[model samples]
Target chain A: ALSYREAVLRAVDRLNEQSSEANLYRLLELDQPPKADEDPGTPKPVSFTVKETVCPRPTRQPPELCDFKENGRVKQCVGTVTLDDITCNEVQ
Target chain B: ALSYREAVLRAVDRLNEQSSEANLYRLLELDQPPKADEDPGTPKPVSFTVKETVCPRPTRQPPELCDFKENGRVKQCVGTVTLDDITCNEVQ
Candidate 1:
């Protein structure tokens, strides 16, 4: 059985591979809270901190709907991680 | 103007959102190298380290072609990050 901490780490790796973009990610924190619909067989809702490197040409292939800093330059971003199946997204 | 380091960070953030999976990710390292076909307007080739968490039910939504540990439980994965458009993948 994979621990919550381990699961979060795996999510990060998958994010990097799946994105296939020119950036790196780092973990800042991992938090697991009690879930109302907790399932022993499944992992609970885990919140983790993520720091990402901003790309120079930060544009999507098909140009999906995403938010980014337009004027101010962002050296890195500290956001929250959310998961769907095997995919990972930063809600914050 | 976004720096190489900043660009990489943005890529990571994008990864998290695009994947929308139930796992967290962390960054291990970031590396940049000179490109022969470097363009002054575009970002150069950059490599970075990534760590991911394994999910209890590790599987893709639509089930795209991907590689994962069959038997041995992977607590986390430390891989390399490559970029395409706004997508990211771990070649290692």
Candidate 2:
């Protein structure tokens, strides 16, 4: 049987797709992502992902062995997230 | 008949009250209010009520008009809210 949390999380994603930003952020983050690049004037498009498990350390930085094996090709990728920091705007 | 929004709001409050602080604070504020005067201190017992309408530019606060009149103090009643800014705390 599906556990309570699993069922709830599935429902959350479905509801999120049908909801508005005011509430979607309410469920997630209402403001910009704290970690960003040097563009101080306004925010730019940044990306993030929520993995089922947390990765604290990298197996290797820009792994030199990538030529032999594909990068994270076998790992299951649920999806990608695009976070737009509300206050951050691109400097023209 | 109460509209769907009203019913959902009422239910939200009820369910929120039955839930934990993480949620009540979620329904209210995940962080501190921007308008406070001090450290906010772990969100001390700040009290508030939801007015049926909104107020803009409330002034004459320093104006102390004495000898005011009182009535049954009855007007349409709604509810109150207490928000504790998430990151603010105190030691004592």
Candidate 3:
């Protein structure tokens, strides 16, 4: 955590611990949208808005979790769940 | 475990277990690529291919994690780390 190097090393290490690959392909976990047929099973991405409020429209780099990922998976934000509660701790 | 209800309840339970809010918004996770200049700080997303091998084209949804983000933080992915050895358990 002293440097970015440490962060990545740790991140890579953590992923390796989970992967069974001899030469794993670790990367930050991205959304895995439900399959076309499987869409009914998973939740959907949260519908965002331009009107900032207490949320103040999260303005992080690259727009933290924008509406409709360009090519990547959208959220399955179904079920009774909330993002404000979760922390990068859980995501990391 | 019992049904989708059970699965969702479990997921919600975990998010709430970590949340600090009376009401929360939970969504499936996604990659947070590094910032532009900030990208200089984080690891860059790994390059991929269609030349299927032992680790052939990873055919997940919307793609589990792809190269060069359409949007989102680009990984500082420039230091001393390798993805082969990582796991989703870590990302999740």
Candidate 4:
């Protein structure tokens, strides 16, 4: 039988393999933590908190603004706000 | 006056400028979502949910297990789990 780690990753791996980025959120439902009072059943659910930022219009420029060049012309910002931070909970 | 975007970025920028990654979490307090029902004061805090996983032993192997050379040996896996998923809440 797969270990706990393999089980969690296997689910993620299968989802990524079966679809595209646009559809990830749909697959993530299985990945989310269980309800507070629910039994942490087999293939236990992982739970943790993440923060989100809301930067309304004006200051909330498109992520294109976050782009810059570093290391002598190599474009930077791959991991630094790759998507609009204003959109994704993923941050820099 | 600085926009809220500017304010948030400024804090992150200042912290990044002042030190290294080892100290980032300390500065993140200012970045965390504020208490529920609290006055959502100036420099409004951003809040969101993040999930964490726990993978006990064996299968929770070293991240070195996740690495693979790609396209004639130029490494990939940048976003694919640079750190240990079993260790950090960070995942693939």
Which residue pairs in candidate 4 collide? A50-B50
DockQ (CA atoms), all models: 0.04, 0.02, 0.04, 0.02
lDDT of 4 at B75: 11
Q: Best by TM-score, which number? A: 1
- Candidate 4 chain B minimal-lDDT segment of 10 residues: B74-83
Q: Identify the runs in model 2 with alpha carbons over 4 angstroms from their true place.
A: A1-92, B23-92
TM-scores across all candidates? 0.20, 0.13, 0.16, 0.16
Cα lDDT for residue B11, model 2?
36
On residues A28-71, what C-alpha lDDT tens digit does candidate 3 reach at each position? 43332223342354443322111111222223222223343333
Chain A, candidate 2, TM-score of: 0.22
Reported per model, the fraction of native interface contacts reproduced equals: 0.05, 0.00, 0.01, 0.00
lDDT of 1 by residue, A11-92 (tens): 5655655653333344433333323342234322222234322333334332123333344222223322232122333333
Q: Kindly give the stretch of ten consecutive residues in candidate 3 chain A with the minimal lDDT sum.
A: A47-56
User: Chain B alone, model 4: TM-score?
Assistant: 0.23
Residues B19-83, candidate 4: write the lDDT tens digits: 32222211122233222353233221111122322222223343224433222111111112211
Docking class of 2: incorrect
TM-score of chain B of 2: 0.22
lDDT of each: 0.36, 0.23, 0.33, 0.27
User: Cα lDDT for residue B29, model 4?
Assistant: 28
Q: Which ten residues in a row have the lowest lDDT in candidate 2 chain A?
A: A72-81
> Each prediction's Cα RMSD?
26.0, 26.4, 22.3, 24.4
